[PDB]
Ligand binder design. Structure first.
Ligand SMILES: C[S@+](CC[C@H](N)C(=O)[O-])C[C@H]1O[C@@H](n2cnc3c(N)ncnc32)[C@H](O)[C@@H]1O
Length: 266
């Protein structure tokens, strides 16, 4: 078998591969599809929640690279590739945009290295986001991002994998690295008291190692002093929609996660 690489199959699911399976990608093994299937059986709207997270990723990156004028992105916990990735969105509005992707799953590097050796403004590497010091000093980071100028750091679909004991220091390190005029874009599994939210967090914790549903206020808090851009921290489908959407008529899948983008002030 030539793909996914058999040497990466330990009959254990990974976060990247399961999310890929939820989106209908082929970068996954049976253990990943089995867990996605199981999760969908217990968690209504799970796949739709992933779709909405990808759609807000696109809308947010388009806001950042176009309107906000940002040319430098650090995409933490990037995941495996989809039909619309960060650098593709960024370059569609801003041909000079530069994106550095970071993921812990080696399959992300293996797939991507292929796709991105032809792009001098896009780089990918394997690392653990819980070690900001290592990521912020990596040669791909240092050669691609000048942190003395505005940048965007993204923890899209990533915040709920940071435990209570590490989250404050980890997200704080990345906020602290940024120049005034920079942005932090995150999305997260949310606890608004709907039953599936904490059940989904449990399944993720038990099967994938980490999974923390945060209240809207706990999500907002991880933006620190940054100034939230309108509409603030809201269900992912409600974040600057480009397609009609009614906040009182959301499905269960549209209430699993929230999105927010905040700006660092001078
Ligand atoms: C794939 S899902 C979200 C993907 C993408 N950011 C999105 O929102 O569409 C979460 C991703 O975060 C990565 N991840 C979780 N914890 C990580 C960590 N501590 N260091 C690096 N990557 C991590 C997973 O491997 C996975 O690829």
């Amino acid at each position: 078998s030539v793909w996914p690489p058999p040497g990466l199959d330990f009959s254990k699911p990974t976060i990247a591969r399961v999310y890929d399976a939820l989106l209908g990608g082929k970068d996954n093994f049976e253990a990943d599809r089995a867990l996605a299937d199981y999760a969908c059986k217990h968690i209504p709207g799970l796949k739709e929640s992933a779709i909405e997270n990808r759609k807000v990723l696109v809308r947010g990156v388009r806001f950042l690279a176009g309107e906000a004028g940002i040319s430098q992105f650090l995409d933490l916990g990037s995941g495996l590739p989809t039909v619309q990735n960060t650098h593709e969105v960024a370059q569609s509005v801003n041909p000079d945009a530069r994106v550095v992707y970071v993921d812990i799953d080696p399959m992300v590097l293996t797939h991507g290295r292929a796709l991105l050796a032809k792009d001098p403004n896009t780089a990918v590497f394997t690392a653990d986001v819980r070690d900001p010091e290592y990521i912020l000093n990596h040669p791909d980071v240092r050669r691609m991002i000048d942190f003395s100028r505005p940048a965007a750091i993204m923890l899209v679909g990533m915040l709920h994998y940071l435990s209570p004991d590490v989250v404050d220091r980890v997200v704080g390190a990345y906020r602290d690295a940024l120049a005034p005029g920079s942005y932090l874009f995150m999305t997260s599994l949310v606890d608004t008291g709907l039953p599936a939210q904490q059940k989904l967090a449990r399944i993720t914790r038990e099967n994938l190692g980490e999974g923390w549903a945060r209240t809207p206020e706990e999500i907002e808090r991880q933006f620190g002093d940054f100034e939230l851009v309108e509409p603030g921290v809201v269900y992912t489908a409600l974040w600057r929609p480009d397609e009609p959407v009614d906040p009182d008529n959301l499905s269960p899948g549209e209430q699993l996660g929230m999105a927010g983008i905040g700006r660092k002030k001078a």
